[PDB]
């Protein structure tokens, strides 16, 4: 098969910059039949289908910003975007139609801003949940920059790391923060022997650990 | 306005067969190639198989991944495009897409599909548990509060979340859901000012479409 490579895989830029993303073939895309590099560019923004941006390498899909700018020839192919926005946040993808169809891996294109630190909340077993015999803790970690970030969590001051499952929602496009969910799910009957809960979320716009707490006796 | 629907994805057990269509409108479906492409969760996009137009005698192409074992048809007369999955295996769970296409001749716009979700397993439909996330009851006060809702133990994807039916949109993370015991769990937040819960109303809508079940959950201070 033709084989198509992306690089990088991932790339961050601040508002206002240009990008630029590699694809490259395993054989030439031009049909010189009629002159033309059958190599097409995609923008899929999560959760959205798929939306072709150029065609023939360089030639913009009507009504596409002419900040998205397609070049190259034959085996090399480079997408270009000028003064990146917000909303542009997602995920391209090259595809070759020289044989047949085959997209790329794809490169995910994430937008920088000014570090900040995560609201964290902390929320015990509901009692609705404990009557059907589950028990599970939930820290939320909203709005924070960057996406790297550590929670511990801790039962009469000591550590836990199984039944601990974290989950991150995708770059908010609006404010470009991240938030993540960390819930920690025990029996009812370990719930119930211990007193004193706790998550820490360790990011580095501060040294100081921000903890959330609760404590069954109050 | 140009139109592709795809419909008949769904839950699958491995080794079985599935049927997805994509219904066309807007355009002379018989003068068009029509393209399937799939993407698993949080994988890349994966282009299938074409299915020619008119002059180039409705003939097939396909990715060798599925050559073999997955056809590609049209029902001309209603214009229709299918995918016909046969020996399915747990690989092949992803969003199916319909997309118009073409030989690059000739310069035509994209059309794709909003798609359609395959889910291959061994797991039953099962619908989800919502419990309400209120504050501790020792929580105290401030300017902003955070409430949630905790969506546990369903199958298949999707879930969606909405708050007050979608009158607090603004402040609301909903995370990806997760897989645990071969179930689906997943957490919703809510921040609104403290002056406006519990005062008014807070209540999370948990849609799951796939058991036809929606959950209203009201949010109620603990004690």
């Known amino acids: 098969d033709i084989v198509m490579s992306q690089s990088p895989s991932s790339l961050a830029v601040s508002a206002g910059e240009k990008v630029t993303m590699s694809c490259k073939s395993s054989?030439?895309?031009?049909?010189?039949?009629?002159?033309?590099?059958?190599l097409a560019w995609y923008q899929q923004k999560p959760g959205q289908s798929p939306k072709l941006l150029i065609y023939?390498?360089?030639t913009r899909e009507s009504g596409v910003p002419d900040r998205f700018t397609g070049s190259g020839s034959g085996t090399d192919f480079t997408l270009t975007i000028t003064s990146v926005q917000a909303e542009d946040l997602a995920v391209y993808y090259c595809?070759?139609?020289?044989?047949?169809?085959?997209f790329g891996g794809g490169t995910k294109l994430e937008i920088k801003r000014a570090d900040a630190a995560p609201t964290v909340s902390i929320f015990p077993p509901s009692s609705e949940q404990l009557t059907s015999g589950g028990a599970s803790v939930v820290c939320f970690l909203n709005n924070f920059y960057p996406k790297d970030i550590n929670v511990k969590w801790k039962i009469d001051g000591s550590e836990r790391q199984n039944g601990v499952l974290n989950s991150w929602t995708d770059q908010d496009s609006k404010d470009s923060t991240y938030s993540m969910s960390s819930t920690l799910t025990l029996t009812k009957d370990e719930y119930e022997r211990h007193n004193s809960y706790t998550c820490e979320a360790t990011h580095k716009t501060s040294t100081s650990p921000i903890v959330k707490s609760f404590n069954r006796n109050e | 306005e140009v139109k592709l629907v795809e419909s008949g994805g769904g839950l699958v057990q491995s080794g079985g067969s599935l049927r997805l269509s994509c219904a066309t409108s807007?355009?002379?479906?018989?003068?068009?190639?029509m393209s399937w492409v799939r993407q698993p969760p949080g994988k890349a996009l994966e282009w299938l198989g074409f299915?020619?137009?008119?002059?180039?005698?409705?003939?097939?192409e396909y990715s060798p991944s599925v050559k073999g074992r997955f056809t590609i048809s049209r029902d001309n007369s209603q214009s229709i495009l299918y995918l016909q999955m046969n020996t399915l295996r747990a690989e092949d769970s992803a969003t199916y897409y319909c997309?118009?296409?073409?030989?690059?001749?000739?310069?035509?716009?994209?059309?794709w599909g909003q798609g359609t979700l395959v889910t291959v397993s061994a797991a039953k439909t099962t619908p989800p548990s919502v419990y309400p996330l209120a504050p501790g009851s020792a929580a105290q006060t401030n300017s902003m509060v955070t409430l949630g809702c905790l969506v546990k133990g369903y199958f298949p994807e999707p879930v969606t979340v909405t708050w007050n039916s979608g009158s607090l949109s603004s402040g609301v993370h909903t995370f990806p859901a997760v897989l645990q015991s071969d179930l689906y769990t997943l957490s919703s937040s809510v921040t609104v000012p403290s002056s406006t819960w519990p005062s008014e109303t807070v209540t999370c809508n948990v849609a799951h479409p796939a058991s036809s079940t929606k959950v209203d959950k009201k949010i109620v201070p603990r004690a």
């Open positions: 807007g355009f002379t479906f018989t003068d068009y190639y």
């Open positions: 299915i020619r137009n008119k002059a180039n005698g409705y003939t097939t």
């Open positions: 595809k070759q139609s020289y044989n047949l169809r085959t």
């Open positions: 023939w390498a360089s």
């Open positions: 997309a118009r296409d073409h030989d690059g001749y000739y310069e035509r716009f994209s059309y």
């Open positions: 054989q030439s895309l031009l049909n010189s039949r009629t002159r033309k590099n059958y």
